[PDB]
Amino acid sequence: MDVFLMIRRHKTTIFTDAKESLKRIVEGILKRPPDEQLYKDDQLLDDGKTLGECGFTSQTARPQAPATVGLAFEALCIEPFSSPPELPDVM
Amino acid sequence: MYVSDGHEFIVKREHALTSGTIKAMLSGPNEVNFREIPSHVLSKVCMYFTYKVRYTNSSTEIPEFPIAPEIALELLMAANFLDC
Amino acid sequence: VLRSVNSREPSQVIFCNRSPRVVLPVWLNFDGEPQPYPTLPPGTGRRIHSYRGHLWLFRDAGTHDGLLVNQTELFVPSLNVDGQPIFANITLPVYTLKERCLQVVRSLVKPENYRRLDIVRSLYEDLEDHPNVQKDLERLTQE
Amino acid sequence: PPNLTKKMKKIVDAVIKYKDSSSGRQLSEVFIQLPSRKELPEYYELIRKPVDFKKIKERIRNHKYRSLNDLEKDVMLLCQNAQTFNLEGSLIYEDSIVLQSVFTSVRQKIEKEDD
Ligand SMILES: Cc1ncsc1-c1ccc([C@H](C)NC(=O)[C@@H]2C[C@@H](O)CN2C(=O)[C@@H](NC(=O)c2ccnc(N3CCN(c4cc(-c5ccccc5O)nnc4N)CC3)c2)C(C)(C)C)cc1
Ligand code: NA
């Protein structure tokens, strides 16, 4: 169907959507070659554009909660975000 | 085509068009920066952006847009300050 | 001013609750007045004996949030052609992120304590203005 | 009438929740609320003493039934009404007859098995 995902690299992030069955879109946007690139949870993904075969079915990568994907010639921990305040009036 | 406590984010232009306030800064009469909002709120914001277009006027059984309680206070001021 | 037509002609109707809320079917008495009917669990659906031309309004039974039936604001039983019961698909709308953020906050704080938030003085109005039944009626009746 | 109401409740509660053995429908839902005067002028004129269950429900609440024998002839009047307004063999007709023998068979169980 249509899977909605989320790629991050050192706090810079892309929201887009593709089919359940890649990086070529990166080359058009980042103007860097696609072969230089790309994985989740320390398990790169070679054979690109097969999307689903790794776990990104139409229920995990949904718009209200996209699925995280990482981008690489360097390894890196994409910088996380800020944390919530939990104001005390509620509860 | 496409566009910490700042913006630093890129989404489709049409998904940007969702918010009314951000239909004003650019293309008036590019990049856009936010000097108030953190980086954790902008996640749930542009998540609503993608959630908005995919489901509006699509007769499929619409599911809820989720909100964690620790996020409500700061999305609300955002979506207020965003006319969305 | 806005109510149901008294054709005695029946209409087998069925409510498919296709939304995560608990839906509250609301019938509109012939004096414009609303009368409520038993609630509907989120996933399930139920068959009814309604009569053609009548007016149904749908709404969360707990927050009274705006619920969508058959893709439109309201539902009027048409005539069932081959006896096929008419389907009132009770689904959600796509709320504004402002509205959606409003509902989550009303769920987490009591009214006697709304004003103690350290938030914008405008949103207090937007919070204290709750989604109402008859209020939305004057809005639809207006043109 | 110390718990006299409590037993009338069971009686009416049982008749309403009665389900057909083949169809399963609640078989009392027509009779629950009787449509209004503006909306059915010919019932209220042809019928001497109109009645539905909502009135019996709340007549029990006012406990104006001195006896169970009192409660019966209201529920009896209820079907006797529907049998005149409706045609012999019509769905509503043949069902009012059923509930007559539903209130009948239910009264026996309740009175005895509670002293
Ligand atoms: C939504 C929902 N979710 C979960 S569960 C549920 C649900 C809710 C309600 C219902 C009931 C069963 N269904 C309605 O609530 C419908 C759905 C709405 O559209 C409206 N509605 C009404 O009931 C209103 N109006 C009329 O019914 C009306 C109007 C004009 N004419 C009417 N006729 C002509 C005359 N009839 C006869 C009656 C009797 C008789 C009856 C009682 C005692 C002695 C008798 O002798 N005997 N013989 C007849 N021929 C009845 C049909 C009826 C109401 C005002 C009564 C509330 C079912 C399911
Ligand atoms: Na009824």
Coordinates of all heavy atoms in Angstrom, one line a residue, chain D residues 38-78, unseen atoms left out:
Chain D
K38 N -49.7 14.7 18.4 CA -49.4 15.4 17.1 C -49.1 14.5 16.0 O -49.4 14.7 14.8 CB -48.3 16.4 17.3 CG -48.0 17.3 16.1 CD -46.9 18.3 16.4 CE -45.5 17.7 16.4 NZ -45.0 17.3 15.1
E39 N -48.5 13.4 16.3 CA -47.9 12.5 15.4 C -48.6 11.2 15.1 O -48.3 10.4 14.3 CB -46.4 12.1 15.9 CG -45.7 13.4 16.2 CD -44.5 13.2 17.0 OE1 -44.1 12.1 17.2 OE2 -43.9 14.3 17.4
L40 N -49.7 11.0 15.9 CA -50.6 9.8 15.7 C -52.0 10.2 16.3 O -52.3 9.7 17.4 CB -50.0 8.6 16.4 CG -50.7 7.3 16.2 CD1 -50.7 6.8 14.8 CD2 -50.0 6.2 17.1
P41 N -52.7 11.1 15.6 CA -54.0 11.5 16.2 C -55.1 10.4 16.3 O -56.0 10.5 17.1 CB -54.4 12.7 15.4 CG -53.8 12.3 14.0 CD -52.5 11.7 14.4
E42 N -55.0 9.4 15.4 CA -56.1 8.4 15.3 C -56.0 7.3 16.4 O -57.0 6.7 16.7 CB -56.1 7.8 13.9 CG -54.9 6.9 13.5 CD -53.8 7.6 12.8 OE1 -53.8 8.9 12.9 OE2 -53.1 7.0 12.1
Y43 N -54.8 7.1 16.9 CA -54.7 6.2 18.1 C -55.5 6.8 19.3 O -56.4 6.2 19.8 CB -53.3 5.9 18.4 CG -53.1 4.8 19.5 CD1 -52.7 3.5 19.1 CD2 -53.4 5.0 20.8 CE1 -52.5 2.5 20.1 CE2 -53.2 4.1 21.8 CZ -52.8 2.8 21.4 OH -52.7 1.8 22.4
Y44 N -55.0 7.9 19.7 CA -55.5 8.5 21.0 C -57.1 8.7 20.9 O -57.7 8.8 21.9 CB -54.8 9.8 21.3 CG -53.4 9.7 21.6 CD1 -52.4 9.9 20.7 CD2 -53.0 9.3 22.9 CE1 -51.0 9.7 21.0 CE2 -51.7 9.2 23.2 CZ -50.7 9.4 22.3 OH -49.4 9.2 22.6
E45 N -57.6 8.8 19.7 CA -59.1 9.0 19.6 C -59.8 7.7 19.6 O -60.9 7.6 20.3 CB -59.4 9.8 18.3 CG -60.9 10.1 18.2 CD -61.2 10.9 16.9 OE1 -60.3 11.2 16.1 OE2 -62.4 11.3 16.7
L46 N -59.3 6.7 18.9 CA -60.0 5.4 18.9 C -59.9 4.6 20.2 O -60.7 3.8 20.5 CB -59.5 4.5 17.7
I47 N -58.8 4.9 21.0 CA -58.5 4.2 22.2 C -58.9 4.9 23.4 O -58.6 6.1 23.6 CB -57.0 3.9 22.2 CG1 -56.5 3.2 20.9 CG2 -56.6 3.1 23.5 CD1 -57.2 1.8 20.7
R48 N -59.7 4.2 24.3 CA -60.2 4.9 25.5 C -59.1 5.3 26.4 O -59.0 6.5 26.7 CB -61.2 3.9 26.2
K49 N -58.3 4.4 26.9 CA -57.2 4.7 27.9 C -55.9 4.2 27.3 O -55.5 3.1 27.4 CB -57.5 3.9 29.2 CG -58.7 4.4 29.9 CD -59.2 3.4 30.9 CE -60.2 3.9 31.9 NZ -61.6 3.6 31.6
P50 N -55.2 5.1 26.5 CA -53.9 4.8 26.0 C -52.9 4.5 27.1 O -53.0 5.0 28.2 CB -53.5 6.0 25.2 CG -54.8 6.7 24.8 CD -55.7 6.4 26.0
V51 N -52.0 3.6 26.8 CA -51.0 3.2 27.7 C -49.8 2.5 27.0 O -50.0 1.9 26.0 CB -51.5 2.2 28.8 CG1 -52.0 0.9 28.2 CG2 -50.5 2.0 29.9
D52 N -48.6 2.7 27.5 CA -47.4 2.0 27.0 C -46.6 1.6 28.3 O -47.0 1.9 29.4 CB -46.6 2.8 26.0 CG -46.3 4.2 26.5 OD1 -46.7 4.6 27.6 OD2 -45.6 5.0 25.8
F53 N -45.5 1.0 28.0 CA -44.7 0.5 29.2 C -44.0 1.6 30.0 O -43.9 1.5 31.2 CB -43.6 -0.5 28.7 CG -44.2 -1.9 28.4 CD1 -44.5 -2.2 27.1 CD2 -44.4 -2.8 29.4 CE1 -45.1 -3.5 26.8 CE2 -44.9 -4.0 29.1 CZ -45.3 -4.4 27.9
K54 N -43.6 2.7 29.3 CA -42.9 3.8 30.0 C -43.8 4.4 31.0 O -43.4 4.8 32.1 CB -42.5 4.9 29.0 CG -41.5 5.9 29.5 CD -41.1 6.9 28.5
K55 N -45.1 4.4 30.8 CA -46.1 4.8 31.8 C -46.2 3.8 32.9 O -46.3 4.2 34.1 CB -47.4 5.2 31.1 CG -47.4 6.5 30.4 CD -48.6 6.6 29.4 CE -48.3 7.8 28.5 NZ -49.1 7.8 27.2
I56 N -46.3 2.5 32.5 CA -46.3 1.5 33.5 C -45.1 1.5 34.4 O -45.1 1.3 35.6 CB -46.6 0.1 32.9 CG1 -47.9 0.1 32.2 CG2 -46.5 -1.0 33.9 CD1 -48.4 -1.3 31.8
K57 N -43.9 1.6 33.7 CA -42.6 1.7 34.4 C -42.7 2.8 35.5 O -42.3 2.5 36.6 CB -41.5 2.0 33.4 CG -41.1 0.9 32.5 CD -40.5 -0.3 33.3 CE -39.1 0.2 33.8 NZ -38.1 0.4 32.6
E58 N -43.2 3.9 35.1 CA -43.2 5.1 36.1 C -44.5 5.1 36.9 O -44.5 5.8 37.9 CB -43.0 6.4 35.3 CG -42.5 7.5 36.2 CD -42.4 8.8 35.5 OE1 -43.5 9.4 35.2 OE2 -41.3 9.3 35.2
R59 N -45.5 4.4 36.5 CA -46.6 4.2 37.4 C -46.2 3.3 38.6 O -46.6 3.5 39.7 CB -47.8 3.5 36.7 CG -48.8 4.5 36.0 CD -49.9 3.8 35.3 NE -50.7 4.6 34.4 CZ -51.6 4.1 33.5 NH1 -51.8 2.8 33.5 NH2 -52.2 5.0 32.7
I60 N -45.4 2.2 38.3 CA -44.8 1.4 39.3 C -43.9 2.3 40.2 O -43.9 2.1 41.4 CB -44.0 0.3 38.7 CG1 -44.9 -0.7 38.0 CG2 -43.2 -0.4 39.7 CD1 -44.2 -2.0 37.6
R61 N -43.2 3.3 39.6 CA -42.4 4.2 40.4 C -43.2 5.0 41.4 O -42.7 5.2 42.5 CB -41.6 5.1 39.4 CG -40.5 5.9 40.1
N62 N -44.3 5.5 41.0 CA -45.3 6.1 41.9 C -46.0 5.1 42.8 O -46.8 5.5 43.6 CB -46.3 7.0 41.1 CG -45.6 8.1 40.4 OD1 -44.6 8.7 40.8 ND2 -46.1 8.4 39.2
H63 N -45.8 3.8 42.5 CA -46.5 2.7 43.2 C -48.0 3.0 43.4 O -48.4 3.1 44.5 CB -45.8 2.2 44.5 CG -45.5 3.3 45.4 ND1 -46.4 3.8 46.3 CD2 -44.3 4.0 45.6 CE1 -45.8 4.8 47.0 NE2 -44.6 4.9 46.6
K64 N -48.7 3.3 42.3 CA -50.1 3.4 42.3 C -50.8 2.1 42.1 O -52.0 2.1 42.0 CB -50.5 4.4 41.2
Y65 N -50.0 1.0 41.9 CA -50.6 -0.3 41.8 C -50.8 -0.9 43.2 O -49.8 -1.3 43.9 CB -49.7 -1.3 41.0 CG -49.5 -0.8 39.6 CD1 -48.4 -0.2 39.1 CD2 -50.5 -1.1 38.6 CE1 -48.2 0.2 37.8 CE2 -50.4 -0.8 37.3 CZ -49.2 -0.1 36.9 OH -49.1 0.3 35.6
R66 N -52.0 -0.9 43.7 CA -52.3 -1.5 45.0 C -52.0 -3.0 45.1 O -51.6 -3.5 46.1 CB -53.7 -1.2 45.5
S67 N -52.3 -3.7 44.0 CA -52.1 -5.1 43.9 C -51.3 -5.5 42.6 O -51.2 -4.7 41.7 CB -53.5 -5.8 43.9 OG -53.3 -7.2 43.8
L68 N -50.8 -6.7 42.6 CA -50.4 -7.3 41.4 C -51.6 -7.5 40.4 O -51.5 -7.3 39.2 CB -49.7 -8.7 41.6 CG -48.3 -8.6 42.1 CD1 -47.6 -9.9 42.2 CD2 -47.5 -7.7 41.2
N69 N -52.7 -8.0 41.0 CA -53.9 -8.0 40.2 C -54.3 -6.6 39.6 O -54.9 -6.5 38.6 CB -55.1 -8.5 41.1 CG -56.3 -8.9 40.3 OD1 -57.3 -8.3 40.3 ND2 -56.2 -10.1 39.6
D70 N -53.8 -5.5 40.3 CA -53.9 -4.2 39.7 C -53.0 -4.1 38.5 O -53.3 -3.6 37.5 CB -53.6 -3.1 40.8 CG -54.7 -3.0 41.8 OD1 -55.6 -3.9 41.8 OD2 -54.7 -2.1 42.6
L71 N -51.7 -4.5 38.8 CA -50.7 -4.3 37.7 C -51.1 -5.1 36.5 O -50.8 -4.6 35.3 CB -49.3 -4.8 38.2 CG -48.2 -4.9 37.2 CD1 -47.9 -3.6 36.5 CD2 -47.0 -5.5 37.8
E72 N -51.7 -6.2 36.6 CA -52.0 -7.1 35.5 C -52.9 -6.4 34.5 O -52.7 -6.3 33.3 CB -52.6 -8.4 35.9 CG -53.0 -9.4 34.8 CD -53.4 -10.7 35.3 OE1 -53.0 -11.1 36.5 OE2 -54.1 -11.5 34.6
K73 N -54.1 -5.9 35.0 CA -55.1 -5.3 34.1 C -54.6 -4.0 33.4 O -55.4 -3.6 32.5 CB -56.4 -5.1 34.9 CG -57.3 -6.3 34.7 CD -58.1 -6.6 36.0 CE -59.0 -5.5 36.4 NZ -59.8 -5.9 37.6
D74 N -53.5 -3.4 33.8 CA -52.9 -2.4 33.0 C -52.2 -3.0 31.8 O -52.4 -2.7 30.6 CB -52.0 -1.5 33.8 CG -52.7 -0.3 34.3 OD1 -53.8 0.1 33.8 OD2 -52.2 0.3 35.3
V75 N -51.2 -3.9 32.1 CA -50.5 -4.7 31.1 C -51.5 -5.4 30.2 O -51.3 -5.6 29.0 CB -49.5 -5.6 31.7 CG1 -48.8 -6.4 30.6 CG2 -48.5 -4.8 32.5
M76 N -52.6 -5.9 30.8 CA -53.7 -6.5 30.0 C -54.3 -5.5 29.1 O -54.6 -5.7 27.9 CB -54.7 -7.2 30.9 CG -54.2 -8.5 31.4 SD -53.5 -9.6 30.2 CE -52.6 -10.8 31.3
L77 N -54.7 -4.3 29.6 CA -55.2 -3.2 28.8 C -54.3 -2.8 27.7 O -54.7 -2.5 26.6 CB -55.5 -2.0 29.7 CG -55.6 -0.6 29.0 CD1 -56.8 -0.5 28.1 CD2 -55.7 0.5 30.1
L78 N -52.9 -2.9 27.9 CA -52.0 -2.5 26.9 C -52.1 -3.3 25.6 O -52.2 -2.7 24.5 CB -50.6 -2.6 27.5 CG -49.4 -1.8 26.8 CD1 -48.4 -1.5 27.8 CD2 -48.9 -2.6 25.6

